[PDB]
Amino acid sequence: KTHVQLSLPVLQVRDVLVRGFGDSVEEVLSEARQHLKDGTCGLVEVEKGVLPQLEQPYVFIKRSDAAPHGHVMVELVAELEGIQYGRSGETLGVLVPHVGEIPVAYRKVLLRK
């Protein structure tokens, strides 16, 4: 399927134990996609102070349309040293590995895969 419905646990940045997916733009997009598939991906909502507490390269989910069955359609965009790889809409948050942290909410998305 070209899109998959996921509900992503929303984590507070200071709870996150593994603060990024890897060391290159290609690796973090790859690992993010794998973790999304395996159900082991969390979401940190971006506010002042958040991104410097996380590890670059970042993986964002961004809105890719103006929303079926309650799920916002999203796509991945990576960022490294101020340059983004991918082009999309508003940021919904930054993805991180989930290794059992307790979420504050869940965010329903329709992921372009």
UniProtKB/Swiss-Prot annotation:
Subcellular location: Host cytoplasm
Residues of the CoV Nsp1 globular domain: 2-113
Region (Disordered): 1-113
Job of this protein: Inhibits host translation by associating with the open head conformation of the 40S subunit. The C-terminus binds to and obstructs ribosomal mRNA entry tunnel. Thereby inhibits antiviral response triggered by innate immunity or interferons. The nsp1-40S ribosome complex further induces an endonucleolytic cleavage near the 5'UTR of host mRNAs, targeting them for degradation. This inhibits the integrated stress response (ISR) in the infected cell by preventing EIF2S1/eIF2-alpha phosphorylation upstream of stress granule formation and depletes host G3BP1.
Protein name: Host translation inhibitor nsp1
Source species: Severe acute respiratory syndrome coronavirus 2 (2019-nCoV)
Shown residues in whole-protein numbering: 11 to 125 of 7096
